[PDB]
PDB file of C-alpha atoms in Angstrom:
ATOM      1  CA  UNK A   1       3.084 -10.207  -6.604  1.00  0.00           C
ATOM      2  CA  UNK A   2       6.771  -9.982  -8.161  1.00  0.00           C
ATOM      3  CA  UNK A   3       7.394  -7.216 -10.074  1.00  0.00           C
ATOM      4  CA  UNK A   4      10.593  -7.405 -12.560  1.00  0.00           C
ATOM      5  CA  UNK A   5      11.587  -3.948 -11.934  1.00  0.00           C
ATOM      6  CA  UNK A   6      11.610  -4.700  -8.334  1.00  0.00           C
ATOM      7  CA  UNK A   7      13.397  -7.705  -8.802  1.00  0.00           C
ATOM      8  CA  UNK A   8      16.012  -5.529 -10.817  1.00  0.00           C
ATOM      9  CA  UNK A   9      16.813  -3.061  -8.163  1.00  0.00           C
ATOM     10  CA  UNK A  10      18.602  -5.726  -5.911  1.00  0.00           C
ATOM     11  CA  UNK A  11      19.917  -8.491  -7.593  1.00  0.00           C
ATOM     12  CA  UNK A  12      23.372  -8.846  -8.392  1.00  0.00           C
ATOM     13  CA  UNK A  13      25.609 -10.812 -10.645  1.00  0.00           C
ATOM     14  CA  UNK A  14      28.475 -13.340 -10.559  1.00  0.00           C
ATOM     15  CA  UNK A  15      30.546 -15.200 -12.831  1.00  0.00           C
ATOM     16  CA  UNK A  16      31.939 -18.493 -13.138  1.00  0.00           C
ATOM     17  CA  UNK A  17      31.811 -19.283 -16.902  1.00  0.00           C
ATOM     18  CA  UNK A  18      34.275 -17.145 -17.672  1.00  0.00           C
ATOM     19  CA  UNK A  19      32.436 -15.611 -20.632  1.00  0.00           C
ATOM     20  CA  UNK A  20      33.303 -12.491 -22.276  1.00  0.00           C
ATOM     21  CA  UNK A  21      31.890  -8.953 -21.383  1.00  0.00           C
ATOM     22  CA  UNK A  22      29.766  -8.608 -24.774  1.00  0.00           C
ATOM     23  CA  UNK A  23      28.348 -11.762 -24.533  1.00  0.00           C
ATOM     24  CA  UNK A  24      27.442 -11.625 -20.870  1.00  0.00           C
ATOM     25  CA  UNK A  25      25.448  -8.044 -21.303  1.00  0.00           C
ATOM     26  CA  UNK A  26      23.474  -9.392 -24.040  1.00  0.00           C
ATOM     27  CA  UNK A  27      22.914 -12.657 -21.485  1.00  0.00           C
ATOM     28  CA  UNK A  28      21.863 -10.634 -18.848  1.00  0.00           C
ATOM     29  CA  UNK A  29      19.389  -8.699 -21.433  1.00  0.00           C
ATOM     30  CA  UNK A  30      17.985 -12.301 -22.497  1.00  0.00           C
ATOM     31  CA  UNK A  31      17.652 -13.347 -18.884  1.00  0.00           C
ATOM     32  CA  UNK A  32      15.781  -9.939 -17.727  1.00  0.00           C
ATOM     33  CA  UNK A  33      13.495 -10.529 -21.066  1.00  0.00           C
ATOM     34  CA  UNK A  34      12.858 -13.796 -19.876  1.00  0.00           C
ATOM     35  CA  UNK A  35      11.609 -12.952 -16.412  1.00  0.00           C
ATOM     36  CA  UNK A  36       9.863 -10.377 -17.962  1.00  0.00           C
ATOM     37  CA  UNK A  37       8.011 -12.996 -20.045  1.00  0.00           C
ATOM     38  CA  UNK A  38       5.895 -15.179 -17.849  1.00  0.00           C
ATOM     39  CA  UNK A  39       2.513 -14.601 -15.847  1.00  0.00           C
ATOM     40  CA  UNK A  40       2.146 -14.734 -12.323  1.00  0.00           C
ATOM     41  CA  UNK A  41       2.025 -18.078 -11.360  1.00  0.00           C
ATOM     42  CA  UNK A  42       5.394 -18.702 -13.000  1.00  0.00           C
ATOM     43  CA  UNK A  43       7.014 -15.447 -11.601  1.00  0.00           C
ATOM     44  CA  UNK A  44       5.634 -16.789  -8.044  1.00  0.00           C
ATOM     45  CA  UNK A  45       7.352 -20.352  -8.993  1.00  0.00           C
ATOM     46  CA  UNK A  46      10.584 -18.496  -9.653  1.00  0.00           C
ATOM     47  CA  UNK A  47      10.750 -16.650  -6.915  1.00  0.00           C
ATOM     48  CA  UNK A  48       9.900 -19.753  -4.575  1.00  0.00           C
ATOM     49  CA  UNK A  49      12.916 -21.244  -6.264  1.00  0.00           C
ATOM     50  CA  UNK A  50      14.983 -18.406  -5.759  1.00  0.00           C
ATOM     51  CA  UNK A  51      14.521 -17.567  -2.270  1.00  0.00           C
ATOM     52  CA  UNK A  52      12.195 -19.826  -1.124  1.00  0.00           C
ATOM     53  CA  UNK A  53       9.324 -17.360  -0.718  1.00  0.00           C
ATOM     54  CA  UNK A  54       6.301 -16.838  -2.667  1.00  0.00           C
ATOM     55  CA  UNK A  55       6.391 -12.754  -2.329  1.00  0.00           C
ATOM     56  CA  UNK A  56       9.032 -10.570  -2.916  1.00  0.00           C
ATOM     57  CA  UNK A  57       9.741  -8.246   0.367  1.00  0.00           C
ATOM     58  CA  UNK A  58       8.619  -5.028  -0.083  1.00  0.00           C
ATOM     59  CA  UNK A  59      11.732  -3.234   1.078  1.00  0.00           C
ATOM     60  CA  UNK A  60      15.688  -4.038   0.629  1.00  0.00           C
ATOM     61  CA  UNK A  61      16.317  -4.191   4.346  1.00  0.00           C
ATOM     62  CA  UNK A  62      15.029  -7.611   5.917  1.00  0.00           C
ATOM     63  CA  UNK A  63      16.667  -9.628   3.225  1.00  0.00           C
ATOM     64  CA  UNK A  64      19.127 -11.247   5.428  1.00  0.00           C
ATOM     65  CA  UNK A  65      20.842 -12.667   2.514  1.00  0.00           C
ATOM     66  CA  UNK A  66      21.427 -10.580  -0.921  1.00  0.00           C
ATOM     67  CA  UNK A  67      20.066 -12.490  -4.202  1.00  0.00           C
ATOM     68  CA  UNK A  68      22.671 -13.216  -6.388  1.00  0.00           C
ATOM     69  CA  UNK A  69      23.309 -15.251  -9.689  1.00  0.00           C
ATOM     70  CA  UNK A  70      26.025 -17.476 -10.378  1.00  0.00           C
ATOM     71  CA  UNK A  71      26.662 -18.332 -14.105  1.00  0.00           C
ATOM     72  CA  UNK A  72      28.148 -21.969 -14.050  1.00  0.00           C
ATOM     73  CA  UNK A  73      30.065 -23.391 -16.851  1.00  0.00           C
ATOM     74  CA  UNK A  74      27.766 -24.235 -19.796  1.00  0.00           C
ATOM     75  CA  UNK A  75      25.881 -27.601 -19.405  1.00  0.00           C
ATOM     76  CA  UNK A  76      22.534 -27.783 -21.675  1.00  0.00           C
ATOM     77  CA  UNK A  77      21.464 -31.208 -20.006  1.00  0.00           C
ATOM     78  CA  UNK A  78      21.679 -29.832 -16.158  1.00  0.00           C
ATOM     79  CA  UNK A  79      18.732 -28.092 -14.680  1.00  0.00           C
ATOM     80  CA  UNK A  80      19.703 -24.686 -12.549  1.00  0.00           C
ATOM     81  CA  UNK A  81      19.714 -25.095  -9.132  1.00  0.00           C
ATOM     82  CA  UNK A  82      19.452 -22.713  -5.997  1.00  0.00           C
ATOM     83  CA  UNK A  83      20.824 -22.507  -2.480  1.00  0.00           C
ATOM     84  CA  UNK A  84      17.807 -20.810  -0.285  1.00  0.00           C
ATOM     85  CA  UNK A  85      20.065 -20.455   2.656  1.00  0.00           C
ATOM     86  CA  UNK A  86      21.719 -17.300   0.920  1.00  0.00           C
ATOM     87  CA  UNK A  87      18.979 -17.262  -1.861  1.00  0.00           C
ATOM     88  CA  UNK A  88      21.969 -17.719  -4.764  1.00  0.00           C
ATOM     89  CA  UNK A  89      20.524 -19.119  -7.959  1.00  0.00           C
ATOM     90  CA  UNK A  90      23.213 -21.268  -9.700  1.00  0.00           C
ATOM     91  CA  UNK A  91      22.263 -21.298 -13.614  1.00  0.00           C
ATOM     92  CA  UNK A  92      24.418 -22.859 -16.318  1.00  0.00           C
ATOM     93  CA  UNK A  93      25.296 -20.825 -19.271  1.00  0.00           C
ATOM     94  CA  UNK A  94      22.998 -21.070 -22.127  1.00  0.00           C
ATOM     95  CA  UNK A  95      24.533 -20.353 -25.129  1.00  0.00           C
ATOM     96  CA  UNK A  96      21.346 -21.458 -26.962  1.00  0.00           C
ATOM     97  CA  UNK A  97      18.155 -19.293 -25.629  1.00  0.00           C
ATOM     98  CA  UNK A  98      15.021 -21.827 -26.530  1.00  0.00           C
ATOM     99  CA  UNK A  99      16.778 -24.460 -24.515  1.00  0.00           C
ATOM    100  CA  UNK A 100      17.616 -21.684 -21.504  1.00  0.00           C
ATOM    101  CA  UNK A 101      14.033 -20.659 -21.206  1.00  0.00           C
ATOM    102  CA  UNK A 102      12.665 -24.432 -21.415  1.00  0.00           C
ATOM    103  CA  UNK A 103      15.020 -25.558 -18.883  1.00  0.00           C
ATOM    104  CA  UNK A 104      14.148 -22.601 -16.516  1.00  0.00           C
ATOM    105  CA  UNK A 105      10.195 -23.382 -16.851  1.00  0.00           C
ATOM    106  CA  UNK A 106      11.164 -27.141 -16.094  1.00  0.00           C
ATOM    107  CA  UNK A 107      13.218 -26.197 -12.961  1.00  0.00           C
ATOM    108  CA  UNK A 108      10.399 -23.647 -11.932  1.00  0.00           C
ATOM    109  CA  UNK A 109       7.683 -26.226 -12.348  1.00  0.00           C
ATOM    110  CA  UNK A 110       8.904 -28.321  -9.511  1.00  0.00           C
ATOM    111  CA  UNK A 111       7.485 -27.787  -6.245  1.00  0.00           C
TER     112      UNK A 111
ATOM    113  CA  UNK B   1      15.319   0.199 -27.326  1.00  0.00           C
ATOM    114  CA  UNK B   2      14.015   1.435 -23.831  1.00  0.00           C
ATOM    115  CA  UNK B   3      17.648   0.953 -22.116  1.00  0.00           C
ATOM    116  CA  UNK B   4      17.293   0.387 -18.445  1.00  0.00           C
ATOM    117  CA  UNK B   5      19.896  -0.446 -15.685  1.00  0.00           C
ATOM    118  CA  UNK B   6      20.038  -4.092 -14.966  1.00  0.00           C
ATOM    119  CA  UNK B   7      22.422  -3.812 -11.672  1.00  0.00           C
ATOM    120  CA  UNK B   8      21.323  -3.275  -8.106  1.00  0.00           C
ATOM    121  CA  UNK B   9      22.888   0.312  -7.750  1.00  0.00           C
ATOM    122  CA  UNK B  10      23.064   2.892 -10.342  1.00  0.00           C
ATOM    123  CA  UNK B  11      24.478   5.604  -8.120  1.00  0.00           C
ATOM    124  CA  UNK B  12      25.875   5.621  -5.030  1.00  0.00           C
ATOM    125  CA  UNK B  13      25.669   9.440  -3.616  1.00  0.00           C
ATOM    126  CA  UNK B  14      24.280  11.052  -6.658  1.00  0.00           C
ATOM    127  CA  UNK B  15      20.727  12.769  -6.998  1.00  0.00           C
ATOM    128  CA  UNK B  16      20.717  12.439  -3.048  1.00  0.00           C
ATOM    129  CA  UNK B  17      17.084  12.380  -1.966  1.00  0.00           C
ATOM    130  CA  UNK B  18      15.733  13.014  -5.403  1.00  0.00           C
ATOM    131  CA  UNK B  19      15.346   9.460  -6.555  1.00  0.00           C
ATOM    132  CA  UNK B  20      13.088   8.608  -3.323  1.00  0.00           C
ATOM    133  CA  UNK B  21      10.510  11.294  -4.369  1.00  0.00           C
ATOM    134  CA  UNK B  22       6.822   9.536  -5.691  1.00  0.00           C
ATOM    135  CA  UNK B  23       6.737   8.949  -9.446  1.00  0.00           C
ATOM    136  CA  UNK B  24       3.738  11.478  -9.474  1.00  0.00           C
ATOM    137  CA  UNK B  25       5.717  14.225  -8.235  1.00  0.00           C
ATOM    138  CA  UNK B  26       9.295  13.134 -10.053  1.00  0.00           C
ATOM    139  CA  UNK B  27       8.447  16.338 -12.191  1.00  0.00           C
ATOM    140  CA  UNK B  28       9.337  18.816  -9.435  1.00  0.00           C
ATOM    141  CA  UNK B  29      12.652  17.349  -8.147  1.00  0.00           C
ATOM    142  CA  UNK B  30      15.800  17.586 -10.237  1.00  0.00           C
ATOM    143  CA  UNK B  31      19.329  15.875  -9.767  1.00  0.00           C
TER     144      UNK B  31
END
Protein backbone atom coordinates (compact mmCIF):
# COMPACT_ATOMS: atom_id res chain seq x y z
CA UNK A 1 0.00 0.00 0.00
CA UNK A 2 0.94 3.68 0.21
CA UNK A 3 1.25 5.38 3.60
CA UNK A 4 0.64 9.06 4.33
CA UNK A 5 3.71 9.32 6.58
CA UNK A 6 5.85 7.60 3.94
CA UNK A 7 4.57 10.03 1.31
CA UNK A 8 5.35 12.98 3.60
CA UNK A 9 8.86 11.70 4.35
CA UNK A 10 10.13 12.34 0.80
CA UNK A 11 7.80 14.95 -0.71
CA UNK A 12 8.95 18.50 -1.48
CA UNK A 13 7.00 21.68 -2.22
CA UNK A 14 7.28 24.44 -4.83
CA UNK A 15 5.48 27.75 -5.32
CA UNK A 16 4.31 29.42 -8.53
CA UNK A 17 1.05 31.00 -7.30
CA UNK A 18 2.96 33.50 -5.14
CA UNK A 19 0.73 33.00 -2.10
CA UNK A 20 1.64 34.19 1.38
CA UNK A 21 3.37 31.83 3.81
CA UNK A 22 0.52 31.97 6.34
CA UNK A 23 -2.00 30.78 3.74
CA UNK A 24 0.49 28.31 2.23
CA UNK A 25 1.11 26.47 5.52
CA UNK A 26 -2.60 25.88 6.05
CA UNK A 27 -2.91 24.91 2.38
CA UNK A 28 -0.26 22.23 2.91
CA UNK A 29 -2.19 21.07 5.98
CA UNK A 30 -5.39 20.89 3.89
CA UNK A 31 -3.60 18.89 1.19
CA UNK A 32 -2.19 16.43 3.73
CA UNK A 33 -5.63 15.98 5.31
CA UNK A 34 -7.08 15.34 1.85
CA UNK A 35 -4.35 12.77 1.14
CA UNK A 36 -5.02 11.07 4.48
CA UNK A 37 -8.77 11.02 3.79
CA UNK A 38 -9.37 8.40 1.09
CA UNK A 39 -9.44 4.61 0.73
CA UNK A 40 -6.88 2.23 -0.75
CA UNK A 41 -8.09 2.43 -4.36
CA UNK A 42 -8.12 6.24 -4.31
CA UNK A 43 -4.59 6.56 -2.92
CA UNK A 44 -3.41 3.98 -5.45
CA UNK A 45 -4.96 6.14 -8.17
CA UNK A 46 -3.24 9.20 -6.67
CA UNK A 47 0.19 7.58 -6.70
CA UNK A 48 -0.46 6.34 -10.25
CA UNK A 49 -1.31 9.86 -11.40
CA UNK A 50 1.75 11.19 -9.54
CA UNK A 51 4.63 8.79 -10.24
CA UNK A 52 3.06 6.29 -12.70
CA UNK A 53 3.51 3.59 -10.05
CA UNK A 54 0.68 1.98 -8.06
CA UNK A 55 3.08 1.36 -5.15
CA UNK A 56 5.53 3.74 -3.52
CA UNK A 57 9.09 2.36 -3.39
CA UNK A 58 10.09 1.17 0.06
CA UNK A 59 13.30 3.24 0.14
CA UNK A 60 14.16 6.80 -0.82
CA UNK A 61 17.04 5.47 -2.90
CA UNK A 62 15.81 4.21 -6.25
CA UNK A 63 13.68 7.28 -6.97
CA UNK A 64 15.40 8.52 -10.11
CA UNK A 65 13.53 11.84 -9.69
CA UNK A 66 12.46 13.43 -6.40
CA UNK A 67 8.65 13.80 -6.23
CA UNK A 68 7.51 17.40 -5.93
CA UNK A 69 4.35 19.52 -6.02
CA UNK A 70 4.05 22.71 -8.09
CA UNK A 71 1.35 25.22 -7.12
CA UNK A 72 0.05 26.74 -10.36
CA UNK A 73 -1.87 30.02 -10.33
CA UNK A 74 -5.46 29.53 -9.15
CA UNK A 75 -7.87 28.07 -11.71
CA UNK A 76 -11.01 26.44 -10.33
CA UNK A 77 -11.98 25.08 -13.77
CA UNK A 78 -8.63 23.41 -14.57
CA UNK A 79 -7.86 19.87 -13.45
CA UNK A 80 -4.37 19.32 -11.99
CA UNK A 81 -1.85 17.51 -14.17
CA UNK A 82 1.42 15.69 -13.59
CA UNK A 83 4.77 14.97 -15.25
CA UNK A 84 5.64 11.29 -14.84
CA UNK A 85 9.15 11.74 -16.25
CA UNK A 86 10.16 13.65 -13.09
CA UNK A 87 7.05 12.82 -11.02
CA UNK A 88 6.01 16.44 -10.49
CA UNK A 89 2.37 17.10 -9.61
CA UNK A 90 1.20 20.42 -11.08
CA UNK A 91 -1.88 21.40 -9.06
CA UNK A 92 -3.58 24.83 -9.16
CA UNK A 93 -4.07 26.84 -5.98
CA UNK A 94 -7.64 26.08 -4.86
CA UNK A 95 -8.68 28.70 -2.33
CA UNK A 96 -12.01 26.90 -2.07
CA UNK A 97 -11.83 23.44 -0.51
CA UNK A 98 -14.76 21.36 -1.80
CA UNK A 99 -13.70 22.22 -5.35
CA UNK A 100 -10.16 21.15 -4.42
CA UNK A 101 -11.14 17.65 -3.30
CA UNK A 102 -13.66 17.31 -6.15
CA UNK A 103 -11.06 18.19 -8.78
CA UNK A 104 -8.41 15.99 -7.17
CA UNK A 105 -10.79 13.02 -7.11
CA UNK A 106 -11.83 13.66 -10.72
CA UNK A 107 -8.18 13.88 -11.81
CA UNK A 108 -7.17 10.67 -10.03
CA UNK A 109 -10.31 8.88 -11.29
CA UNK A 110 -9.07 8.89 -14.89
CA UNK A 111 -6.86 5.94 -15.79
CA UNK B 1 -3.66 19.07 17.32
CA UNK B 2 -0.95 16.44 16.74
CA UNK B 3 1.48 18.68 14.87
CA UNK B 4 3.92 16.75 12.68
CA UNK B 5 6.52 17.83 10.10
CA UNK B 6 5.29 18.07 6.51
CA UNK B 7 8.62 18.48 4.65
CA UNK B 8 11.10 15.94 3.32
CA UNK B 9 13.74 16.66 5.98
CA UNK B 10 13.51 17.65 9.64
CA UNK B 11 17.25 17.68 10.38
CA UNK B 12 20.52 17.25 8.49
CA UNK B 13 23.03 15.88 11.02
CA UNK B 14 21.00 16.01 14.25
CA UNK B 15 20.13 12.88 16.29
CA UNK B 16 22.84 10.86 14.45
CA UNK B 17 21.47 7.34 13.98
CA UNK B 18 18.88 7.46 16.75
CA UNK B 19 16.06 8.07 14.27
CA UNK B 20 16.97 4.82 12.49
CA UNK B 21 16.10 2.76 15.57
CA UNK B 22 12.98 0.56 15.46
CA UNK B 23 9.79 2.12 16.76
CA UNK B 24 9.54 -0.61 19.40
CA UNK B 25 12.95 0.24 20.89
CA UNK B 26 12.95 4.01 20.27
CA UNK B 27 12.54 4.41 24.04
CA UNK B 28 16.08 3.04 24.44
CA UNK B 29 17.74 5.66 22.21
CA UNK B 30 18.13 9.39 22.86
CA UNK B 31 19.03 12.39 20.69
